[PDB]
């Protein structure tokens, strides 16, 4: 079934690849060539995870872990039960994500809207590539990548941090965190502001664009504006990863010591030492 306003928008066209062949919907979902490829990659990847898990020690969902190869395999293919499942699953994951992104482009084109959403989605895909592909390529082994496990991936994050003694002092991390926090805070502020205008309470009147701007101008001395808060939110969120990626890539390939010691560039200047 369709939303009451939907039918007029369900026109042919807007595809990147394939034309009319896959230009249709299944229930609410648009398909397209990239919907077909997405489903293929999801099916293969999830099947491989199921099979890999069935060969390990547990069916507990928190405890299951599908891991990359030993460092000694370098950038070569590993045997299936020694890291090869992880390699195949990683390929499926990137195929799925990229297909998802390009499907969003087709959907955007069909609707006549900007492609900002799939462009924004490129950011987490890029970060996944930093962690699983680029950094391991720079260090010479797939085995530096993270394992697929709900809790196990956290054991990887934990050890990776402590390999650099105190990862909190990583300047790319400091930037990434600050963006994470300001973004969460800003989303709260923006959601609450819009709801506060539309829902004044008590049979009071819905307020106005002028009231929205007046509120922040009063509380902090500045209002960014209605369009610009959306540009800002996209910027703050994206920069969680666009800045964090530098901190991740630096650790190993460009810095081998603890992170606190990096700050010696400042602390150890002769003038004040």
């Amino acid at each position: 079934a369709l939303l009451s306003f939907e039918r007029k928008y369900r026109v042919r066209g807007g595809t990147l690849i394939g034309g009319d062949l896959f230009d249709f919907w299944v229930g609410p979902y648009f398909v397209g060539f990239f919907g077909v490829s997405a489903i293929f990659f999801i099916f293969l990847g999830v099947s491989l995870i199921g099979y890999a898990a069935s060969q390990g020690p547990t069916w507990d969902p928190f405890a299951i872990s599908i891991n990359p190869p030993d460092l000694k395999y370098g950038l070569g293919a590993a045997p299936l039960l020694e890291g090869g499942f992880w390699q195949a699953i990683t390929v499926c994951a990137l195929g799925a994500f990229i297909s998802w992104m390009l499907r969003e482009v087709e959907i955007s084109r069909k609707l006549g809207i900007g492609w900002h959403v799939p462009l924004a989605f490129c950011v987490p895909i890029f970060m996944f590539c930093v962690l699983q592909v680029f950094r391991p390529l720079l260090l010479g082994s797939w085995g530096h990548a993270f394992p697929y496990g709900i809790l196990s991936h956290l054991d990887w994050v934990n050890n990776f941090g402590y390999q650099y003694l105190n990862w909190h002092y990583n300047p790319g991390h400091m930037s990434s965190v600050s963006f994470l926090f300001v973004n969460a805070m800003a989303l709260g502020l923006h959601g609450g502001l819009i709801l506060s205008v539309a829902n004044p309470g008590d049979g009071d009147k819905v307020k106005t664009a002028e009231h929205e701007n007046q509120y922040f101008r009063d509380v902090v001395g500045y209002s960014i504006g209605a369009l610009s808060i959306h540009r800002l939110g996209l910027f703050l969120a994206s920069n969680i990863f666009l800045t964090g990626a530098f901190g991740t890539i630096a650790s190993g390939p460009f810095w081998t010591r603890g992170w606190p010691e990096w700050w010696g560039w400042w602390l150890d200047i002769p003038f004040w030492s």
């Binding site: 939303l3 306003f5 928008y9 919907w25 229930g27 609410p28 547990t58 928190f62 872990s65 499907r103 959907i107 955007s108 006549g112 809207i113 900007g114 959403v117 924004a120 809790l151 196990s152 105190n166 909190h168 002092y169 969460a184 989303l187 709260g188 923006h190 959601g191 609450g192 502001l193 819009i194 709801l195 506060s196 539309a198 004044p200 009071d204 009147k205 819905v206 307020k207 664009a209 009231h211 701007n213 007046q214 101008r217 009063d218 509380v219 001395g221 500045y222 209002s223 960014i224 504006g225 209605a226 369009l227 959306h230 540009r231 800002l232 939110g233 996209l234 969120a237 994206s238 400042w266």
Partner: protein
Amino acid sequence: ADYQTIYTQIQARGPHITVSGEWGDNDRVGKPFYSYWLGKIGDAQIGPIYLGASGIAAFAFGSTAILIILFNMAAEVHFDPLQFFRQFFWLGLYPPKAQYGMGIPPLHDGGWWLMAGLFMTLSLGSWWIRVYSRARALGLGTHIAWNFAAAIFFVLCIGCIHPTLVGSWSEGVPFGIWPHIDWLTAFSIRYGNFYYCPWHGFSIGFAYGCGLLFAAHGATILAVARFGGDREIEQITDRGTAVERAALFWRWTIGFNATIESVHRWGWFFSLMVMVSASVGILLTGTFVDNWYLWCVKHGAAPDYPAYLPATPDPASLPGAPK
């Protein structure tokens, strides 16, 4: 491309708007000024700002906390200005190092930390009254204040509620750039690895989720800026093609969708739940769980791995081992 979604190509200037509040119209100060460069990416107008009693009080209480912290940091470098500037990030005002339980620590071992905390808490509460009151003055709902209240409560959990619940001021967060960071690791270690605290996981899920949602929502609105999607209030009261297309983009992509009003409820909820989750986690830590990793082992969740180098018995447990 829609160049307007990147920057404002042609800026408008006009007479400044003032919306009257129920009270406080005479406490706005400053003369607005305009930045051309800011105007490319936001509103060009800066100021005026509202004063009022609650904001004045927040600044007085907050400045007092800040001065207590700075004066203790300065004592740490024996009042040497060049070393203060050099060493600033490493400097801090610490809670008690000795265990006095809930006893008021002496000034030289945590008492100034406690004082700074009190003045900071007063500042926060004072600012909260401003955030709440200003909404009421302008005939708006109090959604922002309730979100801010959750942030403040979290800070109270780590600063003084957890310490009270386990009965030691030694557990509070130090003031200082690096020192407040160091606390994170000390706390995680003491409580058996915060990765294994489910509420740490919930708080992260929500915080990452705010990333996803603000990227998604910001991008959605820019994608429909050609249709005036940024005029969200009248899109709520009178649905336009902007939000019809936004909803269909999502419906067609993920199989379901929000409305222009309800997406702001999702974002408010996600943001609130970062702080609510974190607070629950902290309230349970030390009170009811001592080692999160072991609590996960107990409940059957923790992953286990083969040894790579030989498994290593605790030498303290070996026959004839010294203490």
